[PDB]
Amino acid sequence: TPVTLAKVIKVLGRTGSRGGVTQVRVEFLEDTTRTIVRNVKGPVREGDILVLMESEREARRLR
Amino acid sequence: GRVRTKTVKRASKALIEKYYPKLTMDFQTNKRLCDEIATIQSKRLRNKIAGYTTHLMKRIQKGPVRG
Amino acid sequence: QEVVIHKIRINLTSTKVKQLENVSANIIKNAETFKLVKKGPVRLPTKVLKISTRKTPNGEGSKTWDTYEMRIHKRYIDLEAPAHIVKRITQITIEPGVDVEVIIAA
Amino acid sequence: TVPSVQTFGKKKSATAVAHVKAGKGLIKVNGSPITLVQPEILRFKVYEPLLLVGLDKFANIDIRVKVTGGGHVSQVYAIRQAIAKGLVAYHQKFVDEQSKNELKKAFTSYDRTLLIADSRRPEPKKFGGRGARSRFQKSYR
Amino acid sequence: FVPVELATTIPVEIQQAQQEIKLFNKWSFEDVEVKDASLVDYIQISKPIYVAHTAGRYANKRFRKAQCPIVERLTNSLMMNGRNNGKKLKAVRIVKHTLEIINVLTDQNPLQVVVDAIINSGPREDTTRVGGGGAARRQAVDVSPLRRVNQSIALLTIGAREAAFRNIKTIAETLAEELINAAKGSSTSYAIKKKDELERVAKSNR
Amino acid sequence: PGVSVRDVPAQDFINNYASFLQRQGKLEVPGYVDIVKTSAGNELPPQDSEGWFYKRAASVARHIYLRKQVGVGKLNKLYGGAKNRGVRPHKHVDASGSINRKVLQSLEKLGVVEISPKGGRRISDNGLRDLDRIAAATLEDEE
Amino acid sequence: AIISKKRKLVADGVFYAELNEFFTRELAEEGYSGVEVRVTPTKTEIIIRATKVQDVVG
Amino acid sequence: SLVVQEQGSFQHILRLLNTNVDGNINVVYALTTIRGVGRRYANLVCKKADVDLHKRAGELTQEELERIVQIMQNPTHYKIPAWFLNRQKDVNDGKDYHSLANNLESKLRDDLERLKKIRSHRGIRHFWGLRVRGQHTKTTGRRRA
Amino acid sequence: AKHAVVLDQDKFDRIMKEAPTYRYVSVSVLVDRFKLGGSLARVALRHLENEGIIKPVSKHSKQAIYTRAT
RNA sequence: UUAAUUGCGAUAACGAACGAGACCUUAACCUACUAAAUAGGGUUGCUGGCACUUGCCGGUUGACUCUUCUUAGAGGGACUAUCGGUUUCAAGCCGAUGGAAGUUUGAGGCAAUAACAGGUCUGUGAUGCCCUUAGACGUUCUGGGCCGCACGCGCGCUACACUGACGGAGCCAGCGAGUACAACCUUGGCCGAGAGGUCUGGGUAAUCUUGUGAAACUCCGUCGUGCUGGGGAUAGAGCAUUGUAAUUAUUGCUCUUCAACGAGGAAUUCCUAGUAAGCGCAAGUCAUCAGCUUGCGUUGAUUACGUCCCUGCCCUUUGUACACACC
Ligand SMILES: [Mg+2]
Ligand SMILES: [Mg+2]
Ligand SMILES: [Mg+2]
Ligand SMILES: [Mg+2]
Ligand SMILES: [Mg+2]
Ligand SMILES: [Mg+2]
Ligand SMILES: [Mg+2]
Ligand SMILES: [Mg+2]
Ligand SMILES: [Mg+2]
Ligand SMILES: [Mg+2]
Ligand SMILES: [Mg+2]
Phi, psi of E26 (to 5 degrees): -155, -30
Helices (H), D2-112: 43-53, 73-93, 97-108
Give the CA-to-C1' distance from C51 to J52 in angstroms: 63
Contact C72 G38 (CB under 8 A): no
**List of F residues 86-115 with CB within 7 A of strand J:** 86-94, 96-99, 101-102, 104-105, 108
Distance CA D78, CA D69 (A): 10
Contact E48 D110 (CB under 8 A): yes
What is the bridge-based pairing of β-strands D61-68 and D27-29?
parallel
Crossing angle of helices D97-108/D73-93, nearest 10°? Answer: 150
Helix (H, G, I), strand (E, B) or coil at E149: helix
Do E30 and E22 touch, CB atoms closer than 8 A? yes
Count of alpha carbons within 13 angstroms of residue H77, beta-carbon side: 9
The chains found to touch C (3+ Cβ pairs under 8 angstroms) are D, G
| DSSP code at position A49 | E
Asked if G touches F (at least 3 Cβ pairs < 8 angstroms), the answer reads no
Our CA-based measurement puts residue F89 at a distance from the nearest CA of chain D, in whole angstroms, of: 16
Of H116, H111, H117, nearest to H128 (Cα)? H116
Distance CA F132, CA F62 (A): 11
Distance in Å, CA E169 to ligand 1 centroid: 22
D126, D127, D130: best mutation site toward chain C, by most C Cβ within 10 Å? Answer: D127
Question: Domain residues for H29?
Answer: 1-81
Residues H68 and H100 in one domain: no
Q: Is the CB of H23 under 7 A from strand J?
A: no
Distance CA F132, CA F16 (A): 12
Closest nt to D24 (CA→C1')? J55
Q: Which residues contact F110 (CB under 8 A, 6 or more apart)?
A: F26, F27, F127
Residue B42 belongs to some domain of the structure: yes
Asked if H touches E (at least 3 Cβ pairs < 8 angstroms), the answer reads no
Residue ending a domain, among H42, H63, H81, is: H81
Q: Which nucleotides of J are covered by protein (CB under 7 A)?
A: 1-4, 6-9, 16, 20-24, 26-31, 34-38, 40-42, 48-52, 55-60, 68-74, 76-83, 89-96, 98-110, 118-120, 122-123, 147-181, 187-196, 201, 204-207, 209-211, 213-226, 228-229, 231-239, 247-250, 252-258, 262-263, 269-281, 283, 290-291, 293-307, 309
Chain D residue with Cα closest to F1: D24
| DSSP code at position B21 | S
Angle value at C-alpha F15, between F12 and F17, nearest 5 degrees: 110
Our CA-based measurement puts residue C63 at a distance from the nearest CA of chain D, in whole angstroms, of: 6
Residues H75 and H100 in one domain: no
CA distances from D119 to B65, D10, E37 (A): 40, 10, 36
Angle value at C-alpha H30, between H29 and H32, nearest 5 degrees: 65
Of E126, E34, E147, E195, nearest to A52 (Cα)? E126
Asked if C touches E (at least 3 Cβ pairs < 8 angstroms), the answer reads no
Which amino acid is located at I47 in the chain? H
| DSSP code at position D124 | P
Q: Is H35 on the interface with F (CB under 8 A)?
A: no
Do C65 and C53 touch, CB atoms closer than 8 A? yes
Asked if E touches B (at least 3 Cβ pairs < 8 angstroms), the answer reads no
I65, I68, I70: best mutation site toward chain E, by most E Cβ within 10 Å? Answer: I65
What is the CATH classification number for the domain harbouring I41?
Answer: 1.10.10.10
Q: Which ligand is nearest to the CA of C60?
A: 7
Q: Which residues contact E118 (CB under 8 A, 6 or more apart)?
A: E39, E43, E70, E149, E152, E153, E182
Of G55, D32, B24, B48, nearest to F7 (Cα)? D32
Our CA-based measurement puts residue G11 at a distance from the nearest CA of chain C, in whole angstroms, of: 12
Residue numbers after which chain C breaks, C to N beyond 2.5 angstroms: none
CA distances from F78 to C74, F65, F70, F72, F81 (A): 34, 15, 11, 10, 8
Tell me how crowded residue D82 is: count the other CB atoms within 10 A of its CB: 29
Which amino acid is located at A49 in the chain? I
Give the CA-to-C1' distance from C65 to J135 in angstroms: 50
Helix (H, G, I), strand (E, B) or coil at H100: coil
Residues making up the binding site of F = 43, 84, 90
The chains found to touch B (3+ Cβ pairs under 8 angstroms) are none
CATH topology of domain G1-58: GMP Synthetase; Chain A, domain 3 (3.30.300)
| DSSP code at position E182 | H
Distance in Å, CA C70 to ligand 10 centroid: 26
Residues H130 and H94 in one domain: yes
**List of B residues 5-64 with CB within 7 A of strand J:** 5-7, 9-10, 26-28, 31, 41-45, 47-48, 50-52, 54-55, 58-59, 62-63
Contact D41 E93 (CB under 8 A): yes
Distance CA B53, CA B4 (A): 12
Distance CA D93, CA D75 (A): 27
Helix (H, G, I), strand (E, B) or coil at I23: coil
Do E27 and E18 touch, CB atoms closer than 8 A? no
Q: Is the CB of D81 under 7 A from strand J?
A: no
Residues H14 and H52 in one domain: yes
Edge-to-edge strands, sheet with A6-15? A49-50, A6-15, A21-27, A35-40, E138-142, E125-129
In chain C the domains, ranked by start, together with CATH numbers, are 1-106 (3.30.70.600)
Distance in Å, CA F11 to ligand 4 centroid: 70
Closest nt to B54 (CA→C1')? J79
DSSP notation for C21-75: HHHHHHHHHHHHHTT-EEEEEEE----EEEEEEESSSSS-SS--EEEEEEE-EEE
| DSSP code at position F69 | S
CA–chain centroid gap for G39, Å, is 11
Domain A1-63 bears CATH identifier 2.40.50.140? yes
Q: Which residues contact H111 (CB under 8 A, 6 or more apart)?
A: H91
Do H15 and H62 touch, CB atoms closer than 8 A? no
Question: Domain residues for B48?
Answer: 1-61
CA distances from C40 to A40, C4, C37, C78 (A): 68, 21, 10, 7
Q: Is the CB of H2 under 7 A from strand J?
A: no
Give the CA-to-C1' distance from D141 to J270 in angstroms: 16
What is the CATH classification number for the domain harbouring B31?
Answer: 1.10.60.20
Please state which CATH number belongs to domain D1-141: 3.30.230.10
Tell me which method was used to determine the 3D structure.
cryo-EM
Question: Domain residues for I7?
Answer: 1-70
**Which chain C residues are Cβ-neighbours of D127 within 8 angstroms?**
63-65
Contact D55 E96 (CB under 8 A): no
Distance CA H98, CA H115 (A): 20
Do C24 and C12 touch, CB atoms closer than 8 A? yes
**Which chain I residues are Cβ-neighbours of H56 within 8 angstroms?**
7
Do G31 and G50 touch, CB atoms closer than 8 A? yes
Distance in Å, CA D28 to ligand 7 centroid: 51
Question: Domain residues for F8?
Answer: 1-143
Residue numbers after which chain D breaks, C to N beyond 2.5 angstroms: none
| DSSP code at position B64 | -
Of C17, H90, E179, C15, nearest to G37 (Cα)? C15
Long-range residue pairs from F74-78, CB within 8 A, at least 24 positions apart, any chain = F75/F100, F75/F104, F76/F100
Domain boundaries, chain E: 1-206
Per this entry, what is the length of chain G? 58
* Residue C54, strand partner residues: C65
Distance CA H29, CA H45 (A): 13
**E136-174: string of b/e by CB count within 10 Å (b at 16+)?**
eeebbbbbbbbbbbbbbbbbbbbbbbebeeeeebbbbbb
Distance CA D78, CA D74 (A): 6
Distance CA C42, CA C77 (A): 6
| DSSP code at position H21 | B
Query: For chain G, first and last CA: distance in Å?
Result: 33
Q: Is the CB of E166 under 7 A from strand J?
A: yes
Tell me how crowded residue D42 is: count the other CB atoms within 10 A of its CB: 22
The number of folded domains in chain F is: 1
User: Is H138 annotated among the ligand-binding residues?
Assistant: yes
Phi, psi of C88 (to 5 degrees): -60, -45
Of D36, D45, D58, nearest to D114 (Cα)? D45
DSSP notation for F70-116: --HHHHHHHT-EE---TTSPP-EE-B-HHHHHHHHHHHHHHTSEEEE
- Superfamily name and number for E1-206: Ribosomal protein S7/S5 (1.10.455.10)
Do F7 and F143 touch, CB atoms closer than 8 A? no
Of D84, D74, D61, D72, nearest to D11 (Cα)? D74
| Resolution of the structure, angstroms | 3.8
Chain D residue with Cα closest to C52: D127
For the four alpha carbons of F17, F18, F21 and F27, in that order, the dihedral sign comes to positive
Angle value at C-alpha C13, between C8 and C18, nearest 5 degrees: 115
Distance CA H68, CA H62 (A): 10
**List of H residues 30-59 with CB within 7 A of strand J:** 32, 34-42, 54
Q: Which residues contact H82 (CB under 8 A, 6 or more apart)?
A: H75, H76, H88, H96, H98
Helix (H, G, I), strand (E, B) or coil at A15: strand
